[PDB]
Design an enzyme around this catalytic site. Sequence first.
Site, PDB file in Angstrom:
ATOM      1  N   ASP A  96       0.818  -1.204   0.000  1.00 43.76           N
ATOM      2  CA  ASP A  96       0.000   0.000   0.000  1.00 43.76           C
ATOM      3  C   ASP A  96       0.859   1.265   0.000  1.00 43.76           C
ATOM      4  O   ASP A  96       1.918   1.302   0.628  1.00 43.76           O
ATOM      5  CB  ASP A  96      -0.908  -0.007   1.235  1.00 43.76           C
ATOM      6  CG  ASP A  96      -1.755   1.250   1.348  1.00 43.76           C
ATOM      7  OD1 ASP A  96      -2.695   1.407   0.544  1.00 43.76           O
ATOM      8  OD2 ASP A  96      -1.477   2.076   2.243  1.00 43.76           O
ATOM      9  N   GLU A 108       1.593  -0.710  -4.956  1.00 42.16           N
ATOM     10  CA  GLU A 108       0.576   0.253  -5.330  1.00 42.16           C
ATOM     11  C   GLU A 108       1.210   1.588  -5.621  1.00 42.16           C
ATOM     12  O   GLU A 108       1.611   2.319  -4.716  1.00 42.16           O
ATOM     13  CB  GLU A 108      -0.461   0.447  -4.221  1.00 42.16           C
ATOM     14  CG  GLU A 108      -1.673   1.256  -4.684  1.00 42.16           C
ATOM     15  CD  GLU A 108      -2.098   2.347  -3.709  1.00 42.16           C
ATOM     16  OE1 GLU A 108      -1.558   2.420  -2.588  1.00 42.16           O
ATOM     17  OE2 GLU A 108      -2.992   3.137  -4.069  1.00 42.16           O
TER      18      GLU A 108
END
Length: 496
Positions: free
Chosen positions: A197, A233
């Site tokens: 993330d 990401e």
Amino acid sequence: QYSPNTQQGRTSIVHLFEWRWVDIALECERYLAPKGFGGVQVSPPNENVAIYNPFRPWWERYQPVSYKLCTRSGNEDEFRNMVTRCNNVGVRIYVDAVINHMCGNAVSAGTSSTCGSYFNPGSRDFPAVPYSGWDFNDGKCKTGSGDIENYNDATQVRDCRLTGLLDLALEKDYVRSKIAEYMNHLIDIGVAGFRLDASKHMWPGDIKAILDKLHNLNSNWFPAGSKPFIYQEVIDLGGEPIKSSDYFGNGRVTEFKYGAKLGTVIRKWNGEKMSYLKNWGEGWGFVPSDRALVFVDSHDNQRGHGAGGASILTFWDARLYKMAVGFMLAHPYGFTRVMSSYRWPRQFQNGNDVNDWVGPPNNNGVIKEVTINPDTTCGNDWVCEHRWRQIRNMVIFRNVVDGQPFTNWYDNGSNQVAFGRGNRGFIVFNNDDWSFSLTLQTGLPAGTYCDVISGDKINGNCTGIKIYVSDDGKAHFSISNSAEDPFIAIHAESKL
Ligand SMILES: *[C@@H]1O[C@H](CO)[C@@H](O)[C@H](O)[C@H]1NC(C)=O
Ligand SMILES: [Ca+2]
Ligand SMILES: [Cl-]
């Protein structure tokens, strides 16, 4: 890092967004395994802040309080149970790793966490890890507010707070070790990989340093030397000093240009048309296929909280959505991730949805269980797109044509296109405002094939459209612009 570690033959993963561990374990056995799904991306399994204003939003899970496997999805026992059962059935588990930061700096101190752990954002105290003021980038960030103010400065994008989220000093070995400790615990449990993330907010080198401390996959389920699948990401559209190519050395990256472009093309925005998809892929400025993780929509941008904006297609646009997903799953570019969401009360005002914060279906904060209807659909407000016949059958289509080259392309210079995959698959789309009726070269062996979009091949018979392929591989296709699903797909395993 670059291999998904899925069982030979499974080419897709599904994001079971906000699902409980017990429900995922069941889904693995009753559906995911039998249907050929390769794995599952789970929501962050570590303890997060319990926000009540708004109530319980989905984004509270991106604000860590500790690395304890304790969340609204279940406890550590239930988590371990899910990984074991899923692995035993050939379905891998991929963890959403939120390691760039902790919770918001403005969050009040106390025990308002999913596991009751105490924390104090104000003083940078997270005793459950433990982390202290020395473990954050407060002294490193040079912005006046302490938050990221300008994305044209790659330095503050990495050293400052993302909208207030306390930024971890990932260059310190102590912090790198605490994160590796967490991830190694998960790897040893059986997870096959991770979604990193906010990777754009971390230095490629810091990420590498952490990956270097990671173990190989559990030898009870994976062959020796197996490395965890890593997909970072990174929202990289055009014009930024930070490029997703900078992260190729750590693993794959999310190609957000994929869904954004496909959305505008299928919606036919700004003069775009499906015939332009002839050179879909790297020819469109996308990252190399062997470094790409693709998807039509994500948990973030399906609610306008991410890159893509208004063009992104979601379950709300069922008809066009199924088509986009169908094209993605049929096309050879990248590794595909299928989305699985829940319904929320979309309330638009001045163009924006004021209810984009609403969390998963629940009863007083308690996430509702996923229920299966007699028609294999879900209840309790879970959309379960992965169970839609048109999507599930395309998931299988990708498996069947895996390895086959892109060929027999056809287009009418507008929005009627078709192509095949070697001699194992063929797909036809009609997105024009008129009907499509024509004989195409499918490259498939002669025979009668069941259209997997309109129906299924059930014991020597098709429940939907039937296509007849002649000796020379030609076949006639008829799709009215009024069809519920304006596209037909047939493959080697749908042949009668
Ligand atoms: C397919 O359906 C027809 C009736 O519509 C039936 O006569 C035939 O035996 C069926 N074939 C198989 C293999 O089930
Ligand atoms: Ca950072
Ligand atoms: Cl993502």
